[PDB]
Amino acid sequence: MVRRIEDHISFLEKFINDVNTLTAKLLKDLQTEYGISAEQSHVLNMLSIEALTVGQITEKQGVNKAAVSRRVKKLLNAELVKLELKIIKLSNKGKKYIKERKAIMSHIASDMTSDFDSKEIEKVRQVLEIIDYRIQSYTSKL
Amino acid sequence: MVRRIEDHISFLEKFINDVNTLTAKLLKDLQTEYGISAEQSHVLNMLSIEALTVGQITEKQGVNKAAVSRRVKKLLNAELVKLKIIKLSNKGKKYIKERKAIMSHIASDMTSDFDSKEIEKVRQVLEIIDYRIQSYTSKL
């Protein structure tokens, strides 16, 4: 079992890099055309799901109390995000951006899974949901 | 069905960020113990797979023409990397094995209660996806 989960782990690290490498390539032009970097794009993607504060973002991101403060002020100056700890939500324009990001992904994902059996995907998705639940739970403890 | 594939992509992205988040917190002390930052640790990660040069590294990495050359310099001076042809040293490999031990122990604990065939089904689905992604980034 040792060489087993270790193989799964090695495999998942590779799958994650390939997903990141492919995502960056498919979004280079959009970010280019919106004047934002990959890093700022990943921040808009986090806020497409829930309104966050520099505090939250920093925890999920990593060691960047200032690098986050900067990136967020830059997003505010580009009017891609807005305020209401502070109320950091997406502006209408950051939403247009997220809609054009989803539409680009959704499209190649669709063509890539058109043949999958939804009953099988559904079982796989439940398993990953439980693991996701345990990762988030463990992240909370310590 | 377009709102279902969107849900899957979002879930998939959320899963990946949760893993990256957890991975960062689990390794901070070890990275700290070795005198390196998370970003220099990513360069070791790569070199753990295959010996590379600043060429391969900058690409996969992404946007980083000289920010990568720097992290390498620091790793080279730390004696984790070794020299063109950039490889890991026996000290760099000791960091990767200890990294592997921390991750493997956590991953197996979160997974020990699953049926081996359930995990294999997940593995097969992800392999087919990774197959198709590599095949795609291959084209353009």
Residues 73-112 of A with CB under 8 A from B: 102, 105-106, 108-110, 112
Which tokens go with B33?
């113990």
Please indicate if any CB of chain A lies within 8 Å of the CB of B16: yes
- Please indicate the experimental technique that yielded this structure: X-ray
Picking from B107, B121, B130, the nearest residue to A123 by CB comes out as B121
Closest CA–CA distance from residue A40 to any residue of chain B (Å): 13
**B115 contact residues in A (CB cutoff 8 A):** none
Query: Taking the CB of residue B138, how many other CB atoms lie within 10 A of it?
Result: 7
Sole residue written with tokens 């879930």: B11
Query: Taking the CB of residue B19, how many other CB atoms lie within 10 A of it?
Result: 19
Cα end-to-end distance, chain A, whole Å: 26
Burial of B90 (0-12, 13-18, 19+ CB in 10 A): exposed
The domain limits of chain B are: 1-140
Please indicate if any CB of chain B lies within 8 Å of the CB of A32: no
Residue B124 CA, distance from chain mean position: 20
Collapsed DSSP state (helix, strand, coil) of residue B36: coil
Taking every pair of C-alpha atoms in chain B, what is the biggest distance, in angstroms?
53
Query: Taking the CB of residue B82, how many other CB atoms lie within 10 A of it?
Result: 16
Q: Per DSSP, what are the bridge partners of residue B88? A: B81
Which tokens go with B132?
């198709």
Continuous segment of H or E residues that includes residue B82: strand B81-82
Q: A107-142 burial by CB neighbour count: b if 16+ within 10 A, else e?
A: eebbebbeeeeeeeeeebbebbeebbebbeebbeee
The CATH number that domain B1-140 falls under is 1.10.10.10
d(CA A58, CA B52): 32
Spatial CA neighbour of A94 closest among A111, A76, A112, A107? A76
CATH match for A1-142 among 2.10.109.10, 1.10.10.10, 3.20.20.140, 1.10.1740.10:
1.10.10.10
Q: Per DSSP, what are the bridge partners of residue A89? A: A82
Q: Residue ranges of the alpha helices (H) in B35-66?
A: 38-49, 54-61
Residues A104 and A30: beta-carbon distance below 8 Å? yes
Query: Taking the CB of residue B97, how many other CB atoms lie within 10 A of it?
Result: 10
